[PDB]
Amino acid sequence: RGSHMEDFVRQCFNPMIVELAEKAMKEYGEDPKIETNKFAAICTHLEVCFMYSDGGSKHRFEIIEGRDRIMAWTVVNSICNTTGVEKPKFLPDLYDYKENRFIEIGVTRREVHIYYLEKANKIKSEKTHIHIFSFTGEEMATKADYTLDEESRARIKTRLFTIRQEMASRSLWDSFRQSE
Ligand SMILES: COc1cc(CCNC(=O)c2[nH]c(-c3ccc(C(F)(F)F)cc3)nc(=O)c2O)ccn1
Numbered sequence: 001r002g003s004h005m006e007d008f009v010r011q012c013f014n015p016m017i018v019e020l021a022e023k024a025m026k027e028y029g030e031d032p033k034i035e036t037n038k039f040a041a042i043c044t045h046l047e048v049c050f051m052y053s054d055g056g057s058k059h060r061f062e063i064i065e066g067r068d069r070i071m072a073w074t075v076v077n078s079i080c081n082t083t084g085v086e087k088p089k090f091l092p093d094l095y096d097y098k099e100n101r102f103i104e105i106g107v108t109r110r111e112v113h114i115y116y117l118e119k120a121n122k123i124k125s126e127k128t129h130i131h132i133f134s135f136t137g138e139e140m141a142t143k144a145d146y147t148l149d150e151e152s153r154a155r156i157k158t159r160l161f162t163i164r165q166e167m168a169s170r171s172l173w174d175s176f177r178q179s180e
């Protein structure tokens with residue numbers, strides 16, 4: 001199954017980001033060859049998480065996304081057990097040592113409010129931080145604390161819009177938006 005979407009996502013994203021997305025989808029029983037929109041979304045979320053951890057100081061974050069399930073949970077346990085913070089029900093994306101909390105990164109093709117409320121209804125023990133970026137260039141964070149510098153968030157927003165543009169130039173953006 002040779003799709004324009006798959007070749008585009010391989011030309012658009014870092015080879016390592018691509019490999020991590022592939023491993024994560026296959027672990028979840030999904031096929032990147034034939035479920036290509038989801039492959040692109042997973043790559044995008046990955047790159048945003050990495051970009052985000054690159055903001056701030058150097059020892060600041062611990063990266064949870066992009067690991068295998070078992071080691072990601074091992075790090076989450078080490079975090080909770082050394083810092084005393086409650087253990088979250090679901091695997092988050094990062095941990096901020098500077099503010100001592102987990103961070104849940106979201107990336108949506110819809111309005112950021114709906115995505116935020118969705119991600120908030122499934123974490124009832126609401127001690128973790130939610131930060132949502134949209135494809136159109138806005139964002140929303142818990143208690144209005146956007147964690148990072150303005151320049152770092154701006155780099156992320158520019159990147160998401162460049163992805164969206166380049167997708168739309170190949171007429172793949174419509175199928176991507178109308179797929180979430
Ligand atoms: C959810 O199923 C999955 C899950 C995995 C590994 C664990 N996942 C996350 O931790 C995660 N996953 C997503 C996500 C997943 C799929 C889509 C899709 F495909 F619908 F566009 C969009 C967002 N967003 C996040 O913010 C986030 O933290 C691997 C594969 N599939």
Ligand SMILES: [Mn+2]
Nearest residue numbers: 065091092093
């Ligand atoms: Mn995650």
Ligand SMILES: [Mn+2]
Nearest residue numbers: 093104105106
């Ligand atoms: Mn996330």
